[PDB]
Write a protein that binds this ligand. Structure first.
Ligand SMILES: [Zn+2]
Ligand SMILES: [Zn+2]
Lengths: 78, 8
């Protein structure tokens, strides 16, 4: 069944675990940074699991551009 | 894009 929150398994290779996580980005303290993928009905993924550099993540958060996770980015939005 | 924990 499937799960909401910061401790989900965001993708097939998700490295974020509530039992092992530590801060990575300078904006993180006790929670993993996340970003919304606009594919389909949309879903949330951990920014770190997408291999997003900090500045790419911050610029995305400072704009209205939609983001598409690594899994769905190559899908024809046609 | 909408995000979480990206606030300086
Ligand atoms: Zn993840
Ligand atoms: Zn996605």
């Amino acid at each position: 069944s499937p799960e909401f929150g910061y401790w989900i398994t965001c993708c097939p290779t998700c490295d974020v675990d509530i039992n092992t996580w530590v801060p990575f980005y300078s904006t993180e303290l006790n929670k993993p940074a996340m970003i919304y993928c606009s594919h389909g009905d949309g879903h949330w993924v951990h920014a770190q699991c997408m291999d997003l550099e900090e500045r790419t993540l911050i610029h995305l958060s400072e704009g209205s551009n939609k983001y598409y996770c690594n899994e769905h980015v190559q899908i024809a939005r046609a | 894009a909408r995000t979480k924990q990206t606030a300086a």
